[PDB]
Amino acid sequence: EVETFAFQAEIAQLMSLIINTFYSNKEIFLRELISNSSDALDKIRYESLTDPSKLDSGKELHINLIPNKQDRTLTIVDTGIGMTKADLINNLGTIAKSGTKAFMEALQAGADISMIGQFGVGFYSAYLVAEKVTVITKHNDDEQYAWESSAGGSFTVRTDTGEPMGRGTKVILHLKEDQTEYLEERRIKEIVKKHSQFIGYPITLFVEKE
Numbered sequence: 001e002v003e004t005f006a007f008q009a010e011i012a013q014l015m016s017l018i019i020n021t022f023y024s025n026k027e028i029f030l031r032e033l034i035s036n037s038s039d040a041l042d043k044i045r046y047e048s049l050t051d052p053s054k055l056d057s058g059k060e061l062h063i064n065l066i067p068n069k070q071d072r073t074l075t076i077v078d079t080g081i082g083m084t085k086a087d088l089i090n091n092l093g094t095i096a097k098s099g100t101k102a103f104m105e106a107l108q109a110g111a112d113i114s115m116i117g118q119f120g121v122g123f124y125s126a127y128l129v130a131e132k133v134t135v136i137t138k139h140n141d142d143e144q145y146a147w148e149s150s151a152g153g154s155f156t157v158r159t160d161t162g163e164p165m166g167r168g169t170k171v172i173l174h175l176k177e178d179q180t181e182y183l184e185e186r187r188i189k190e191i192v193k194k195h196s197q198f199i200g201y202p203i204t205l206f207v208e209k210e
């Protein structure tokens with residue numbers, strides 16, 4: 001069973017700005033998604049201090065980058081706190097705790113899209129390079145869910161079965177046809193070293209089987 005939701009208007013507007021603004025420095029999407037993963041890892045790390053059983057779903061705190069040229073996907077995986085169903089809907093579908101409004105105003109006042117993470121909306125930079133984004137997530141004490149959107153003002157949520165994660169989040173970027181440079185090992189390595197070199201968790205770049 002698939003549920004379909006409308007983005008909050010301001011989030012739809014933000015996504016359209018990201019999709020339609022001419023802006024060549026697209027590579028910053030990866031730093032923003034890695035940063036979100038790092039935040040999620042900080043959160044489960046902290047919660048596990050006072051409740052060690054929260055790591056029963058996996059003790060290792062890390063980030064995996066998985067390119068697949070056959071599927072034309074780049075997946076950012078973490079073993080962070082994950083998201084409940086309500087978290088998915090609120091945190092990806094609405095302004096929530098973010099500086100969405102401040103960012104859109106800033107872009108009219110000299111700011112540029114690379115500053116998106118300063119406003120807590122870095123997730124949407126995925127749409128610089130992806131035509132569709134799928135988010136698979138598992139939080140302690142909720143079930144596994146799949147969130148999905150190709151923008152256009154709506155997203156879907158369904159339960160996800162058959163490939164259970166222990167705990168965390170997978171952001172699957174279905175890349176635009178002209179953005180396949182981000183599947184190349186040397187390109188990914190270059191971007192991680194440039195923008196994500198101080199992240200306090202291991203980042204493992206998977207090798208392609210083909």
Ligand SMILES: NCCNC(=O)[C@H]1O[C@@H](n2cnc3c(N)ncnc32)[C@H](O)[C@@H]1O
Pocket residue numbers: 011036037040078080081082083090091092093094095096097098120121122123169
């Ligand atoms: N809708 C405004 C932007 N807010 C978010 O993208 C929020 O979604 C959640 N989020 C994004 N990527 C995540 C991730 N990899 N793990 C856990 N939560 C994540 C965070 O709460 C983040 O602040």
Ligand SMILES: [Mg+2]
Pocket residue numbers: 091095096097098120
């Ligand atoms: Mg938020």
Ligand SMILES: [Mg+2]
Pocket residue numbers: 047054139140
């Ligand atoms: Mg928990």
